[PDB]
Amino acid sequence: DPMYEQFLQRIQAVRTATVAKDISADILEARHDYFGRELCRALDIEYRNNVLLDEIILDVYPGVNLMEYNVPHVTADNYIWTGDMLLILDYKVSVGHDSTEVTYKKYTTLILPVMQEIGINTEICIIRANPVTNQISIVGEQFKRLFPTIPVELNFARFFELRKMLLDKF
Ligand SMILES: [Cl-]
Ligand SMILES: [Cl-]
Ligand SMILES: [Mn+2]
């Protein structure tokens, strides 16, 4: 694994806590993006990582005049356009629920009123992989309708190994 190799080299060279904390955050971000890619492959949807809300709206509603709607500058991992409803996608890889509750509050407060003014049915969807158990949790009723089964095959072992290696240096 080329990414694994880069991380191992960073872990070998690291000597301070600030850099060590940066490596760990980079491992988690790589694991998050790994899950996002595998999730999009399993659902047969286009993979994106980070898209702006105004770009989503311009994608699904090409003739929109954005200025009329006070569209905040806000990023999400991905979206699904069904032809009649917009699903905002956030991927998570976590054993807890807290980051889901923070993100859900943020997107429901920032995205849903704009889309309501536009008149486009929208749902905030958070798909979370537990990295310890490999269980998938979904927030988002219409997402669970469209995707009752998620044939993801996930292996987080490489990320656990790198984090353990970094932690074994303390
Ligand atoms: Cl944002
Ligand atoms: Cl995450
Ligand atoms: Mn995410």
Side-chain angles (χ1 to χ4, degrees), residues 1-5 7-14 16-20 22-67 69-152 154-160 162-169:
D1 184 342
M3 162 222 82
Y4 183 98
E5 268 307 298
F7 275 122
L8 204 141
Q9 282 171 219
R10 294 175 59 188
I11 291 175
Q12 293 200 262
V14 68
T16 189
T18 36
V19 188
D22 280 341
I23 290 150
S24 171
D26 287 359
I27 295 159
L28 304 188
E29 206 200 297
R31 180 181 82 165
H32 163 283
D33 297 344
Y34 159 74
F35 170 53
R37 289 189 320 266
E38 289 310 337
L39 174 69
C40 292
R41 207 177 317 251
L43 295 189
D44 205 349
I45 64 186
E46 180 177 335
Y47 174 70
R48 306 176 186 87
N49 88 301
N50 299 325
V51 57
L52 277 305
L53 174 61
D54 69 282
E55 296 185 330
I56 299 174
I57 293 163
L58 281 168
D59 284 349
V60 311
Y61 186 180
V64 67
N65 171 5
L66 287 178
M67 189 169 313
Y69 300 108
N70 192 27
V71 179
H73 183 96
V74 53
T75 300
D77 286 335
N78 204 358
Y79 65 99
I80 289 164
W81 175 239
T82 76
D84 56 277
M85 99 170 307
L86 177 57
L87 311 176
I88 303 299
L89 259 52
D90 176 64
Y91 326 123
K92 296 240 193 275
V93 185
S94 170
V95 299
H97 301 77
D98 273 18
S99 65
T100 289
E101 272 290 272
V102 170
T103 292
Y104 195 68
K105 173 169 199 200
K106 174 182 178 194
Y107 286 162
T108 56
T109 54
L110 293 184
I111 300 187
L112 293 191
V114 156
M115 299 310 300
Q116 186 174 288
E117 283 299 293
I118 291 174
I120 290 193
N121 225 66
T122 301
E123 180 181 282
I124 304 311
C125 314
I126 302 150
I127 308 99
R128 177 178 57 99
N130 183 312
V132 169
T133 65
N134 268 19
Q135 315 159 285
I136 311 302
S137 284
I138 298 158
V139 171
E141 289 303 300
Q142 296 303 315
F143 190 99
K144 294 145 140 190
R145 270 193 74 231
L146 287 150
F147 301 112
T149 39
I150 294 168
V152 278
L154 295 167
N155 195 349
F156 293 110
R158 319 129 55 200
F159 303 95
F160 279 121
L162 292 170
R163 277 257 316 201
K164 169 190 136 113
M165 225 160 294
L166 186 59
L167 261 42
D168 280 0
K169 269 195 161 199

